[PDB]
Amino acid sequence: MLVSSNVTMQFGSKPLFENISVKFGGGNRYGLIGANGSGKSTFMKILGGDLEPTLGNVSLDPNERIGKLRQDQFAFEEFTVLDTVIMGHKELWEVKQERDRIYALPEMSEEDGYKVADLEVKYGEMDGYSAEARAGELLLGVGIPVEQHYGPMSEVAPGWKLRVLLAQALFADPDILLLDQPTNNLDIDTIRWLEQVLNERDSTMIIISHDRHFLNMVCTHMADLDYG
Amino acid sequence: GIREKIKLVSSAGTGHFYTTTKNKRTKPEKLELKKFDPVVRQHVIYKEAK
Amino acid sequence: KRMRVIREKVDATKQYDINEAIALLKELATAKFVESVDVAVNLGIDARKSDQNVRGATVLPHGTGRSVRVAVFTQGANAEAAKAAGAELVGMEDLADQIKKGEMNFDVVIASPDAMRVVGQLGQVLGPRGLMPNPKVGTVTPNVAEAVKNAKAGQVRYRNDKNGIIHTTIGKVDFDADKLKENLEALLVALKKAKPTQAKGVYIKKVSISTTMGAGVAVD
Amino acid sequence: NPFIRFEQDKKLFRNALEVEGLTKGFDNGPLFKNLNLLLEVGEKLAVLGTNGVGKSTLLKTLVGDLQPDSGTVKWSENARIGYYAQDHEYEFENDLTVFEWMSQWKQEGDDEQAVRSILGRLLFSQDDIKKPAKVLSGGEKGRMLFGKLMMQKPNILIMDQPTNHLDMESIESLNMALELYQGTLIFVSHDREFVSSLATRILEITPERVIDFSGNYEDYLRSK
RNA sequence: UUGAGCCUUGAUGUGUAGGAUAGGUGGGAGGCUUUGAAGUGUGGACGCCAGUCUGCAUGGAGCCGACCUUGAAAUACCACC
Ligand SMILES: Nc1ncnc2c1ncn2[C@@H]1O[C@H](COP(=O)(O)OP(=O)(O)OP(=O)(O)O)[C@@H](O)[C@H]1O
Ligand SMILES: Nc1ncnc2c1ncn2[C@@H]1O[C@H](COP(=O)(O)OP(=O)(O)OP(=O)(O)O)[C@@H](O)[C@H]1O
Ligand code: NA
Ligand code: NA
C-alpha cells in the first residue's frame, strides 16, 4: 500500500493538482483517467520516485518491488533488445554484475571469497538461475524471436519494441506502474493478449491507458485526475 | 494574500529555520540563500521547505 | 494399497508425542530400504522478505549417515587441508573444468579465500541443486580442510522454503529412539538460536516426522 | 475541445502523385510488389494493416525521407505537403521554447499574433508559451504538430497516425477539422471509427496482395 | 437456498528446446509391480481438446528412475505448504 501524503506538483503559474492524498493498494487494480497535459504523466513519475513533488511524500513500502518501465521507445535506440531486457529485478541485476567480477577481476582477496560466497547465495535466493528462463519465456511469449534477440534497439518495429520492453516490467513484479499501453496502436489481438495475462496474473497495477474498451476489459478502480 | 508564507530550513542538519514570503506563481524554485546558522554559528545554505 | 491402509492405520488430525511417534515411524517400515527418517518444522517467517530467510548448518553428534565427497576448492593451504582431512577434489579450476566437467558432481564444496575459481566456474552446473559454498554456512571460511572434516562428522545444512518451512533428514531409522531424540533436540536448539531477530509472532507452529515410504505424524 | 481547422493556401486541380512502382522491401521479400495508383486530387485513402506491414516506410518513401529502390513518385509542382510523422522526437530538440518553435514556421506572419493565438486556440496559455517545448508530453506534442500543419496550410497532409495520444475530446476536434478540410490527404491511422468516419479510398496493404479502393470501408469490412 | 472463516479427504496445476498438459522444496538414482500387474472391452470428471484423473472384474503379472531435449527434473516417491 503506497500512500500519497499531500502530494502537490506545480509547473509555472498554475499547479497541476493540489492536496493529493490517496492510499493506493489493496488487491484491486487501479487505472487513472485525465486530459493529457494534466498530471497523469507526472503523477506516476512522482509515485515511482523519479521526480519528487513540490510538497508531499511517496511513503513507499520497503520491499514490495515497485515495477517501472521506460515508456517511450523512440529515444533509447542504443541499448539492444537483450540489453534492455536484461537491465526489473534491480537487486538481481546488481548481484549478477557484482558476481561477474570473478571472470573479470584477475584475482581475489580473503574477504572477497566471503563476498562471492554470499553473492551467489543471494543470486540463488532471488533465483538468478531461472532468471534467464523466465526472461526468455516472456520475450518469446510477447512475440519476438531468438533471431531478433541480439539485434539493435532501432532496427525493429515499435509494434514489437513494446512487446520486448513489456518484459522488463513483468519480472514477477507486484505493484507495477504501466504507462500508456495503447499509443503506437497495437493490433487489438496483442491488446487482448495483454488484457488476458494481466487479468490472470495477480498484482497491483496502475495504468494510464487511453482506450475505453481496453480499460473496460482490464481494470477495476478508476482514478479521475480531472478537476484538481 | 497572493504571496504565500514559506520557510527556509537549514542544511547544517540543525533545526533552525528562517521564514519569509514568496510569490507562489512565478516559477516554483527552492530558494537558495546563504544565511547565518546560530546553532553551529556559521554561514550555511538554507534550502526552502515547508 | 499402502495409502488406503495407512490413512486408516494412522490418523494425522490428532497430535502425537516424541515417545509414540518414533515407535510408530519404526513400526511403518513398509519398504525394503534404509528409510532415512526426516523432520519438517513449519517455521513462522516472512520468507517473502529476505532478512527472515533462515540458512544454516549444524553439527549433529551422530553423523549424516552418508559419504561426504567434500572437494576442498582452495589452492595451496586449502588443498593441503583437503589432503590432510581426505579431500576428494584438489583446489583448482581444473577439477571443475576438465575433471568436474566430465565428472557428474561432488557432495560438498569447501571454499577457501586463496584459490577459489569455482566462484565463477561452478555457475549453474554444480550450484543448481544447492552445492555452492555458502559463506553463511561456513563455505568461505579460514579453514577449508577443517570444514571438510567437520562436514563428515554430521554437518547437515538447512534452508527455509518459499513458504517458511524447514525439512531435512533427522537420521537413519536404523538409529535408536534416544539418538533420534537427541539429534532432534540439537537441531531444534540450533534453529531456535538461528531464528531472525525481526520475526514477529510465534515462529514454530508444527513439527512433523515422516518416513521415506511411510506416512508422517505430528511430533508435538 | 481545441479549435483546429486546416485551411488551404492554394488549390490543386488535376492530381497529386501518380505513383507507378517502388519495389521497396528493406531486407526480406518486398511487402508490396507493384502499387500503381493515382489520386485525381482524391481524399483519405486510409492505409491499414497489422503491426509490421509497412505503412510508415511507404509514407516515408512517398514524401522523401527515403526513396524507392526502383521507380519514381513525383508530386504536382505547385503542391505543399504537411507531415505528421510517425515519430516526432527528431523535431522537438535543440532547446526551443513553445513560442520560438511555433514561430520558426510561418510564411508571412506576425511574431505576436497568428503565432500567439494559434497557440491559444488549442488549450495553451501565457504560462505555456514560455516553457521549453521539449518537456511537453504526448497530446501536447500532437497538438503542436497540428498547429504547425495549420500554420503551414498545406495542400496534402500525410499525417501518419494522428489519433496516437489524443484526448478523445481532441479526437472529435480532429475529426471535425478533417471533414471540413477541402484539400488532399493520406493517412494510415489504425483507429476503427476514424477511417470509418472519413476514409473512402482504402489502400489495404498486405505482404502478398494489396487492395485498392474496395469502397467506403464498410463493404470492405463486411466482405472480409 | 446463498455469502464467510476453520478442519479433513480427494482432486488441480505445458511450453517454446520436445518422449510427456515437466510447482518448488533435494533426502535419495533404486524403488514401484501379484493385501493380482502391462493393455485389451466399458463408463465417468475436467481441459490453451494434444491430453490428466477415476468404480470395474478380467486379461494374469509388466511398467519405471536414469540415460534425456535441460533454468529444473522427471507423479521411483514419502512427507509440509
Ligand atoms: N520539466 C518540465 N518543465 C516544465 N513544464 C513541464 C515539465 N514536465 C512537464 N511539464 C508540463 O506540465 C504539464 C503536465 O503534463 P504531463 O506530462 O504531466 O501530462 P501527461 O498526463 O503525461 O500527458 P498526456 O496528456 O500527453 O497523456 C504539461 O503542461 C507539461 O507540458
Ligand atoms: N527499419 C525497419 N526494419 C525492419 N522492418 C521494418 C523497418 N521499418 C519498417 N519495417 C517493416 O515494415 C512494415 C510496415 O511498416 P510500418 O512501420 O508502417 O508498420 P506498421 O506496424 O503497420 O505501422 P506503425 O506501427 O508504424 O503504425 C512493418 O510491419 C515492419 O515489418
Ligand atoms: Na501521458
Ligand atoms: Na506505419
Side-chain angles (χ1 to χ4, degrees), chain A, chain B, chain C residues 1-65 71 76-77 79 81-82 84-87 91 96 102 111 113 115 120 123 127-128 130 133 135 138 142 145 147 151 153-154 156-220, chain D residues 1-17 19-99 101-203 205-211 213-224:
Chain A
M1 247 182 303
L2 81 170
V3 285
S4 38
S5 51
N6 290 112
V7 174
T8 287
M9 182 75 198
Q10 196 205 10
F11 285 130
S13 189
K14 170 194 305 311
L16 291 177
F17 36 84
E18 307 165 280
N19 210 36
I20 305 315
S21 50
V22 278
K23 302 153 152 140
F24 281 145
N28 47 25
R29 284 144 310 287
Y30 303 86
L32 66 99
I33 317 108
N36 53 85
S38 80
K40 59 188 312 133
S41 216
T42 291
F43 191 23
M44 291 216 268
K45 267 168 50 103
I46 284 179
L47 284 160
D50 252 13
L51 168 136
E52 77 275 65
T54 85
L55 64 136
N57 212 270
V58 291
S59 278
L60 277 182
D61 286 84
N63 44 274
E64 289 328 280
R65 189 71 53 182
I66 181 78
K68 322 151 42 199
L69 63 143
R70 269 70 178 246
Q71 313 74 340
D72 269 286
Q73 297 167 342
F74 256 125
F76 61 53
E77 272 85 348
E78 326 86 55
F79 330 124
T80 68
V81 170
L82 175 73
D83 206 39
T84 323
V85 85
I86 293 194
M87 315 326 164
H89 217 278
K90 297 308 285 285
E91 300 201 60
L92 164 63
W93 180 228
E94 63 81 20
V95 61
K96 184 175 266 199
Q97 270 312 317
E98 182 86 0
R99 200 265 334 161
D100 292 3
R101 231 192 289 278
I102 276 293
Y103 280 27
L105 177 56
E107 34 85 32
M108 83 205 98
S109 91
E110 314 311 275
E111 331 163 318
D112 205 62
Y114 310 171
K115 282 292 290 306
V116 303
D118 80 88
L119 273 154
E120 280 176 303
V121 163
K122 191 136 292 188
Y123 207 10
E125 98 177 47
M126 325 147 269
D127 306 358
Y129 275 17
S130 149
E132 166 86 40
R134 298 174 49 67
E137 216 61 48
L138 265 193
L139 270 176
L140 284 74
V142 278
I144 78 164
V146 198
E147 286 187 300
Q148 266 186 14
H149 264 184
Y150 298 68
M153 201 45 257
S154 167
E155 266 267 34
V156 188
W160 288 25
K161 305 338 278 161
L162 306 145
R163 262 161 200 186
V164 52
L165 204 37
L166 257 51
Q168 226 192 14
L170 297 322
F171 256 132
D173 190 289
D175 194 52
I176 39 178
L177 313 149
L178 285 175
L179 191 139
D180 219 326
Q181 284 324 300
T183 51
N184 199 258
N185 302 42
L186 281 201
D187 259 297
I188 296 104
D189 164 36
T190 319
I191 276 176
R192 207 70 73 218
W193 150 252
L194 205 67
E195 197 278 335
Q196 297 141 352
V197 47
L198 261 196
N199 247 2
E200 291 182 14
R201 149 167 174 167
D202 172 69
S203 163
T204 280
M205 312 86 78
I206 310 185
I207 40 181
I208 188 60
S209 284
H210 260 285
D211 180 78
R212 47 185 312 142
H213 291 152
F214 174 38
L215 290 186
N216 276 292
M217 299 295 267
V218 51
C219 51
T220 51
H221 265 327
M222 293 325 317
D224 205 352
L225 206 152
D226 218 313
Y227 266 14
Chain B
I2 288 326
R3 230 159 148 80
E4 323 225 352
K5 285 145 157 115
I6 65 171
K7 96 168 62 155
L8 318 167
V9 82
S10 96
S11 54
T14 175
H16 172 92
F17 56 95
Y18 290 61
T19 165
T20 207
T21 47
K22 142 176 204 169
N23 192 356
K24 217 82 196 61
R25 44 211 172 111
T26 50
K27 209 266 192 182
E29 333 166 8
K30 304 301 123 178
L31 273 199
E32 291 295 350
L33 304 158
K34 296 193 79 187
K35 304 208 90 90
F36 190 70
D37 201 328
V39 163
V40 82
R41 264 160 70 224
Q42 209 136 347
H43 270 71
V44 290
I45 277 175
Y46 277 59
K47 194 215 98 207
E48 80 107 14
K50 177 63 149 211
Chain C
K1 287 93 52 177
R2 288 74 167 259
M3 300 315 199
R4 282 160 216 96
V5 299
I6 201 67
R7 298 275 162 279
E8 79 200 309
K9 171 172 187 175
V10 173
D11 170 47
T13 298
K14 43 151 181 51
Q15 279 73 248
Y16 291 64
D17 51 276
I18 73 170
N19 315 268
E20 141 170 342
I22 326 179
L24 176 48
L25 271 283
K26 305 181 93 86
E27 196 255 28
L28 305 185
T30 302
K32 160 60 173 190
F33 213 51
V34 164
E35 300 287 276
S36 287
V37 64
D38 320 305
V39 84
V41 281
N42 193 356
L43 274 203
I45 48 184
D46 192 294
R48 324 170 280 170
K49 166 67 202 95
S50 167
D51 82 333
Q52 286 197 14
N53 268 334
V54 185
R55 331 187 57 250
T58 179
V59 181
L60 311 203
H62 308 111
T64 47
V156 76
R157 41 204 63 262
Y158 33 59
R159 176 175 38 81
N160 80 318
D161 209 27
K162 152 73 203 85
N163 280 127
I165 214 161
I166 289 198
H167 34 252
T168 285
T169 179
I170 173 177
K172 286 179 145 61
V173 82
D174 165 291
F175 284 168
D176 199 349
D178 174 338
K179 325 303 164 28
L180 291 151
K181 262 178 207 169
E182 52 212 352
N183 275 342
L184 178 60
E185 273 261 359
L187 171 136
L188 282 181
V189 163
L191 183 42
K192 260 209 196 74
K193 302 316 162 50
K195 81 159 287 186
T197 178
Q198 323 214 8
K200 332 292 196 316
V202 47
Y203 55 113
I204 292 178
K205 294 169 297 320
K206 250 182 68 191
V207 194
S208 175
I209 299 195
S210 187
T211 278
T212 81
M213 301 335 307
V217 307
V219 86
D220 221 356
Chain D
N1 255 45
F3 192 89
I4 60 196
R5 318 261 189 177
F6 329 95
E7 252 164 30
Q8 212 182 10
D9 185 21
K10 194 61 205 87
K11 150 161 48 162
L12 277 184
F13 272 111
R14 305 313 197 292
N15 41 5
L17 293 160
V19 57
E20 307 88 332
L22 299 319
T23 70
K24 181 83 230 85
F26 262 49
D27 38 16
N28 208 250
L31 320 180
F32 46 90
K33 169 182 55 160
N34 241 31
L35 273 290
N36 51 321
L37 280 162
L38 269 61
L39 290 115
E40 79 260 347
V41 193
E43 65 248 52
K44 325 308 194 291
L45 64 106
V47 198
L48 86 158
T50 86
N51 285 182
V53 298
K55 318 164 293 313
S56 277
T57 173
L58 154 78
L59 296 210
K60 288 239 309 170
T61 40
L62 218 65
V63 51
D65 277 3
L66 266 169
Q67 77 285 5
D69 299 82
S70 169
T72 166
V73 195
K74 180 156 102 158
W75 299 85
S76 46
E77 90 274 43
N78 230 21
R80 202 185 306 252
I81 39 184
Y83 189 16
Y84 182 116
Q86 178 66 92
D87 82 7
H88 28 282
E89 289 84 8
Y90 71 88
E91 273 210 341
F92 292 80
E93 309 284 27
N94 85 347
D95 313 62
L96 262 198
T97 189
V98 174
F99 189 92
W101 163 272
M102 191 85 57
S103 184
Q104 86 183 7
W105 317 129
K106 107 180 67 176
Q107 333 186 97
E108 307 283 30
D110 314 330
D111 287 352
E112 245 173 53
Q113 302 160 46
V115 53
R116 189 208 208 288
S117 69
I118 204 46
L119 255 46
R121 241 197 272 132
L122 57 95
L123 280 54
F124 282 142
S125 45
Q126 291 210 213
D127 191 354
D128 301 297
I129 82 173
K130 310 161 315 220
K131 105 191 92 171
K134 150 177 59 183
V135 305
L136 302 188
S137 276
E140 287 169 310
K141 277 203 179 49
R143 287 197 276 135
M144 289 298 270
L145 281 141
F146 291 164
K148 104 162 270 184
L149 283 194
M150 289 154 75
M151 282 265 297
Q152 289 202 328
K153 46 192 45 159
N155 300 357
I156 319 163
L157 322 172
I158 278 177
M159 276 207 318
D160 228 335
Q161 327 209 307
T163 180
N164 256 10
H165 286 253
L166 277 35
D167 226 302
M168 183 272 202
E169 276 86 328
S170 285
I171 281 190
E172 188 262 329
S173 276
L174 186 61
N175 247 19
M176 151 265 282
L178 267 294
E179 303 319 277
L180 200 84
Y181 181 43
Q182 259 85 36
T184 323
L185 81 169
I186 84 180
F187 74 119
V188 317
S189 90
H190 189 342
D191 181 279
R192 308 266 162 198
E193 220 300 295
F194 208 71
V195 317
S196 158
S197 168
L198 58 94
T200 196
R201 255 286 305 264
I202 174 187
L203 203 172
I205 212 174
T206 281
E208 81 295 328
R209 269 289 319 123
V210 304
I211 295 303
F213 190 16
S214 52
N216 199 26
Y217 229 85
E218 81 267 330
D219 46 348
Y220 186 72
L221 271 196
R222 78 189 326 187
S223 95
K224 276 178 194 331

